[PDB]
Amino acid sequence: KVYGRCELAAAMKRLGLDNYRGYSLGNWVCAAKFESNFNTHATNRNTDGSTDYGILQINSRWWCNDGRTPGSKNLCNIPCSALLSSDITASVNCAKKIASGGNGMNAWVAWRNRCKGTDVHAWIRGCRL
């Protein structure tokens, strides 16, 4: 599924992301945009045998098991296929665990590069939340 900007913002709000570990909702929307262009089917290989899955490009080395990544730690306790669903619940619950790491949202390089430090409130402007 390819989400609309405000459709995604609303779904994320209902799942508890606004102000999670000090990050306002627009951070998460902006991250999703630059990670996947809002496409739940997005995948990208990593040069290490792991793969990034879904709207938030969550990797199979640490976070989910895809059955083809040697030594996956599967910290989110989920098959990576669950991150490709039209329902973003699994992706959001996993994303909260990633953002609980020392470096927070810096785990997403696209967020660091394109979102961090900007007025991310813009990403939820015009949405009825």
d(CA 113, CA 80): 25
Q: 57: which 2 tokens?
A: 């490009």
Fold of 1-129: Lysozyme (1.10.530)
> How does DSSP classify residue 23?
B
How much is the CA Rg of the chain, to the nearest whole Å?
A: 14
Beta strands in the chain (DSSP E): 43-45, 51-53, 58-59
Which technique?
X-ray
5-14 vs 25-36: helix axis angle to the nearest 10? 130
Q: Mention every residue, 6+ apart, whose C-beta is less than 8 A from residue 22.
A: none
Region of residue 76 (phi > 0: left; psi between -120 and 50: alpha; otherwise: beta): alpha
- Residue tagged 């969550």 (tokens): 58
> How does DSSP classify residue 58?
E
Residues with catalytic function: 35, 52
| Resolution value (Å, 1 decimal) | 1.1
